From Swiss-Prot:
<comment type="subunit">
    <text>F-type ATPases have 2 components, CF(1) - the catalytic core - and CF(0) - the membrane proton channel. CF(1) has five subunits: alpha(3), beta(3), gamma(1), delta(1), epsilon(1). CF(0) has three main subunits: a, b and c.</text>
</comment>
<protein>
    <recommendedName>
        <fullName>ATP synthase epsilon chain</fullName>
    </recommendedName>
</protein>
<comment type="function">
    <text>Produces ATP from ADP in the presence of a proton gradient across the membrane.</text>
</comment>
<comment type="similarity">
    <text>Belongs to the ATPase epsilon chain family.</text>
</comment>
Amino acid sequence: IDVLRAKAAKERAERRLQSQQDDIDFKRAELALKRAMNRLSVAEMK
């Protein structure tokens, strides 16, 4: 709901994605982004 939180997470996940050693992170960060994005869409045209 709070765009502030959604943004903070998007920025945190984006930075983590850069990590190469965390090969087992892109997967989780991928599902999280997809979820956060979906919520954002509904928010606008709520």
